[PDB]
Amino acid sequence: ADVKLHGSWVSPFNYRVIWALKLKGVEFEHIVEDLTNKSELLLKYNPVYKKIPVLVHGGKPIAESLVILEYIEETWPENPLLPTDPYERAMARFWIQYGATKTAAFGALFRASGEELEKAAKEVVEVLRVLEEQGLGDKKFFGGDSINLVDISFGLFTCWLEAIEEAAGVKVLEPSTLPRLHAWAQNFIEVPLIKENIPDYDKLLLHMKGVREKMM
Amino acid sequence: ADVKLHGSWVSPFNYRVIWALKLKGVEFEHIVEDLTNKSELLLKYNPVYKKIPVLVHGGKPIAESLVILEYIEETWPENPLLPTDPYERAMARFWIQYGATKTAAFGALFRASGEELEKAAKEVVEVLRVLEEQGLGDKKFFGGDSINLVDISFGLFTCWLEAIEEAAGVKVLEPSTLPRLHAWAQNFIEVPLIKENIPDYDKLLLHMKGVREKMM
Ligand SMILES: O=c1c(O)c(-c2ccc(O)cc2O)oc2cc(O)cc(O)c12
Ligand SMILES: O=c1c(O)c(-c2ccc(O)cc2O)oc2cc(O)cc(O)c12
Ligand SMILES: [Cl-]
Numbered sequence: 072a073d074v075k076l077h078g079s080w081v082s083p084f085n086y087r088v089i090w091a092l093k094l095k096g097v098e099f100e101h102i103v104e105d106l107t108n109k110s111e112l113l114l115k116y117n118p119v120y121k122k123i124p125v126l127v128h129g130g131k132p133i134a135e136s137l138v139i140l141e142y143i144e145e146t147w148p149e150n151p152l153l154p155t156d157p158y159e160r161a162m163a164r165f166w167i168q169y170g171a172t173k174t175a176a177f178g179a180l181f182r183a184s185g186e187e188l189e190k191a192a193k194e195v196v197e198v199l200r201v202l203e204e205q206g207l208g209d210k211k212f213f214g215g216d217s218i219n220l221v222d223i224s225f226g227l228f229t230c231w232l233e234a235i236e237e238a239a240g241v242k243v244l245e246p247s248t249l250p251r252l253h254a255w256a257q258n259f260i261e262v263p264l265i266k267e268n269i270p271d272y273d274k275l276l277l278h279m280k281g282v283r284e285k286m287m
Numbered sequence: 288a289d290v291k292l293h294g295s296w297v298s299p300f301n302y303r304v305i306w307a308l309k310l311k312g313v314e315f316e317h318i319v320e321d322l323t324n325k326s327e328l329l330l331k332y333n334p335v336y337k338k339i340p341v342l343v344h345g346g347k348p349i350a351e352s353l354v355i356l357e358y359i360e361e362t363w364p365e366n367p368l369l370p371t372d373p374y375e376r377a378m379a380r381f382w383i384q385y386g387a388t389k390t391a392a393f394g395a396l397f398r399a400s401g402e403e404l405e406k407a408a409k410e411v412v413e414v415l416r417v418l419e420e421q422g423l424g425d426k427k428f429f430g431g432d433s434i435n436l437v438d439i440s441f442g443l444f445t446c447w448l449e450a451i452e453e454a455a456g457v458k459v460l461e462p463s464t465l466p467r468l469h470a471w472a473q474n475f476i477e478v479p480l481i482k483e484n485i486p487d488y489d490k491l492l493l494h495m496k497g498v499r500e501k502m503m
């Protein structure tokens with residue numbers, strides 16, 4: 072194939088790219104990298120971060136999942152994943168950047184214990200509540216009646232967050248506390264494109280248990 | 288005016304917006320906020336971060352300088368500040384995001400001392416060298432023959448970085464160590480649009496001396 076994806080069977084950032092390519096109907100070869108022994112192609116294609124995902128189109132590389140997503144949207148414009156109105160597009164980019172900035176709040180879930188881990192989980196619930204109230208509102212998806220780049224960017228809050236919660240022994244995304252966001256997470260996971268393209272939960276839980284063990 | 292900018296006379300992030308609006312020939316009212324007593328409009332328009340800049344167009348707010356810049360480019364498409372080719376646009380977004388991620392390296396310049404501050408400055412030089420070699424290359428500007436959103440996003444490495452260097456007593460962007468980036472910084476500051484729209488250096492230096500005093 073003319074499109075290659077240097078990926079992973081577990082990274083949520085790689086899954087954002089898989090979803091976008093499948094939504095566009097773009098054929099691609101998935102090259103699963105071993106992060107303990109990175110290939111010559113990965114280091115050549117992404118010299119700045121040496122990380123996956125890396126999309127390679129016509130032999131030219133695009134690194135960083137958020138940059139890859141906008142490249143896919145611009146390259147294959149059919150089945151749009153962003154709105155046409157500039158203000159609506161700015162709101163979508165604003166929420167995507169908000170999610171990208173709050174990564175440190177989720178890290179604390181694998182670094183804190185007891186009366187400190189409860190506080191870290193409460194801080195994550197408040198991050199999600201802002202997203203729920205000001206971002207999702209009463210829509211079925213962040214993209215309205217169907218998923219868009221904003222839903223894709225927040226997909227890591229579904230099975231990956233469920234695995235983090237089970238590995239850390241704390242609750243974050245619950246129906247009592249975040250009713251609309253919890254209903255969104257269920258609806259997103261049930262979209263056939265997402266359902267057919269997510270890691271096996273038991274394998275993902277084992278991976279998150281290892282990451283928590285390393286982060287202590 | 289139909290375009291308002293809730294700004295500042297010193298923030299480099301606010302100056303990115305001033306430059307973009309002036310490059311588009313967009314008339315606007317500049318509302319300088321007092322950060323020790325934020326207005327009702329600022330808190331209403333930017334509830335998530337409560338920060339400047341905030342662009343208000345037709346009474347609708349757009350916060351975060353990078354989101355504002357793409358909104359300006361999409362709303363006033365004449366005098367383009369991004370290329371048309373999707374791969375070229377992805378490279379521009381990639382470098383803009385790289386600059387946005389390396390903010391912590393610059394923070395160390397106002398938190399470290401002696402044999403630790405020399406190390407922090409060396410780390411900043413390596414961040415800039417990657418940008419110079421892989422981003423700028425042999426072009427006059429990141430946008431080629433004229434400035435684009437990438438040059439605008441890196442404008443904080445000109446007089447603001449010069450002020451940080453003088454306040455901290457360390458050298459970072461020098462011609463001997465970064466020849467092309469130093470020539471770029473001189474060329475950027477000499478562009479008439481930039482020259483006529485930058486803070487007074489003595490006032491900016493006094494501001495950075497205060498920020499370093501607070502950051503210790
Ligand atoms: O930072 C995250 C992360 O690295 C990862 C992550 C998980 C598995 C993997 O193989 C790689 C990752 O970067 O997942 C997240 C999931 C979340 O719900 C929230 C997060 O902030 C992360
Ligand atoms: O983080 C910065 C910053 O907050 C600021 C900054 C300076 C003045 C001001 O009023 C507000 C700011 O955020 O300037 C920077 C300049 C640089 O060259 C590099 C930086 O990382 C910053
Ligand atoms: Cl990524």
Ligand SMILES: [Cl-]
Nearest residue numbers: 174175177178
């Ligand atoms: Cl992470």
Ligand SMILES: [Cl-]
Nearest residue numbers: 300340351352
């Ligand atoms: Cl900003």
Ligand SMILES: [Cl-]
Nearest residue numbers: 390391393394
């Ligand atoms: Cl900052």
